[PDB]
DNA sequence: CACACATTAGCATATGC
DNA sequence: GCATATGCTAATGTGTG
């Protein structure tokens, strides 16, 4: 309910503190990584300050940023111190929608991609083709 | 675990200060 | 040139067999 407006107020104040402290969003991600271990990319911080992320994600990243703004105020010095593969895989589709792992290993060795990368890309290919 | 589908979060490049 | 906003899709995660 009002959690929406409370998040929005927190985000506006967060933008104000970030601009006042002279930290870029990539620097914010680096600080989050070096103070918690879960380094985040600057796109996530952008979508946060612009309030683009989903509600569950909104709540999930609220506490980390709360802690960073409540902690970093003390001292800053120590804290500071490809398309052809796509086309080939599309060619591999239209004939065998769900290949076996035996074929997956061959595909991975053929195009030089990691087995897990090819497996997840295959799953998401199926996913977006089953959207429609 | 793993995978069926939903969420999530980082990349390449597009804009902007 | 660096720093933000977008489109887009690897990657995980919920939930499960």
Author numbering: 140 to 220, 238 to 288
Question: How is this structure described in the published paper?
Answer:
Multiple transcription factors can bind together to a regulatory element in a cooperative way, and cooperation between the pioneer transcription factors OCT4 (also known as POU5F1) and SOX2 is important for pluripotency and reprogramming. Our structural and biochemistry data reveal that binding of OCT4 induces changes to the nucleosome structure, repositions the nucleosomal DNA and facilitates cooperative binding of additional OCT4 and of SOX2 to their internal binding sites. OCT4 has two DNA-binding domains: OCT4-POUS and OCT4-POUHD.
The initial cryo-EM reconstructions of the nMATN1 nucleosome in complex with OCT4 showed a density near the linker DNA, similar to the density of OCT4 bound to LIN28B DNA.
